[PDB]
Amino acid sequence: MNQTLLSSFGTPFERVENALAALREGRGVMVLDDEDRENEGDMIFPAETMTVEQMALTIRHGSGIVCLCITEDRRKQLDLPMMVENNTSAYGTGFTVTIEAAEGVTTGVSAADRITTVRAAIADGAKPSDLNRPGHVFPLRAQAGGVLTRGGHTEATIDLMTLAGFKPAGVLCELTNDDGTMARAPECIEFANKHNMALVTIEDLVAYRQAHERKAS
């Protein structure tokens, strides 16, 4: 089992740098935190090449609901701000509504036919119109590199690919099954990721992102 990738070898600076490459190739990397809301996790993959490596682990004991990381410039270029201001209907959820790969993807849960078209669809370069939701892709606007001025992993989503040696565009999901299994603690995500994914945290992991971009000049 490749669970020791980021479990017994995952320190924000020592083992995440060496694991950064190991997982940089979508070899499985989850990020857990100490809060109530749960979402970002084993699916730290790139928002433009959502490989099936995670879908495989999601087809057995997971779902295909990952946090999409998008910077103020990513959505800008994808000039679409549909900020959800559902007064009362939503407690200021600020849910940066999804976007559907109009370049040849229309299923939302088709890791096979979707990761082929999505690879070329969510990753166009200019998608002000090529991304029309609902496309079960929920990108949350997160400051890039500023995840360390946050008490949340949201700003750590755009930074999740930044801290993953990846252009800030990414997916991040936890143990999401269809049986209503409230996956909690690392021991639970460890079940799904211990067999096909490495697992790590976000508190120190993000502190590592700044240590990699520090400047002595």
- The whole-angstrom separation of Cα 183 and Cα 99 is 27
> Which experimental method was this entry solved with?
NMR
Q: Which helix (H) or strand (E) holds 208?
A: helix 203-213
* b/e per residue 192-208 (b: at least 16 CB within 10 A): bbbebbbbbbbeebbeb
CATH, residue 212: 3.90.870.10
Binding residues for Mg(2+): 38, 153
Binding residues: 37-38, 42, 150-154
Residue pair 74/168 in contact (Cβ under 8 Å)? The answer is yes
Question: Long-range contacts: 79-86, Cβ < 8 Å, 24+?
Answer: 79/128, 80/128, 80/131, 82/133
Count of the separate structural domains present in the chain: 1
Q: Which helix (H) or strand (E) holds 158?
A: helix 155-162
Compute how many other C-beta atoms are within 10 angstroms of the C-beta atom of residue 8.
8
Locate 160 and state its tokens: 């999740």
Q: Which domain holds residue 207?
A: 1-217
Residue pair 123/131 in contact (Cβ under 8 Å)? The answer is no
Binding residues for D-ribulose 5-phosphate: 37-38, 42, 150-154
